[PDB]
Ligand binder design. Structure first.
Ligand code: A1B2E
Ligand code: ZN
Length: 139
């Protein structure tokens, strides 16, 4: 679990969005596993606008932050789960690191701000859904 709060927006994994997120929907993309909903309160986070390929993410299944080197956002095959059929997930960044399904929503940050959130993983890998291209989050 986990979300990004920026301005009047809440960014979550689409597969973990609540009834309230869908009732206040701004934008969603099943191919990216992202959903953005509107909030009444001003958010605590700021978004990176950079090409960083190193950062630190929070891993709730270890209660720890880990440093990662990650690939540029790209189209990657993701095996079927209870939430989605087997498909290519877009704007996904891979890295070597521990992650379990409940870790989705953990934030990845670089020196510039929030880069993305945990969305995929397994077998010593962790995948992050990028949010740096979503320029409208800042306005
Ligand atoms: N973006 C997706 O399609 C995810 C939907 C929820 C989900 O369980 N997965 C598969 C999964 N197995 O092991 C993981 C470790 C970390 C994060 C996800 C996973 C993929
Ligand atoms: Zn950066």
């Amino acid at each position: 679990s986990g979300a990004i709060y920026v301005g009047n927006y809440r960014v979550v994994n689409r597969h973990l969005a609540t009834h309230n997120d869908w009732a206040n929907l701004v934008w969603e993309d099943s191919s990216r596993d992202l959903l953005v909903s509107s909030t009444t309160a001003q958010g605590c986070d700021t978004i990176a606008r950079c090409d960083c390929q190193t950062g630190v993410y929070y891993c709730s299944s270890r209660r720890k932050h880990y440093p990662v080197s990650f690939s540029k956002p790209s189209l990657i095959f993701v095996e079927a789960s209870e939430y989605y059929p087997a498909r290519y997930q877009s704007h996904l960044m891979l890295a070597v690191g521990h992650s379990e399904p409940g870790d989705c929503g953990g934030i990845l940050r670089c020196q510039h701000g929030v880069v993305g959130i945990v969305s995929t993983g397994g077998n010593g890998l962790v995948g992050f859904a990028d949010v740096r291209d979503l320029l409208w989050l800042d306005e």
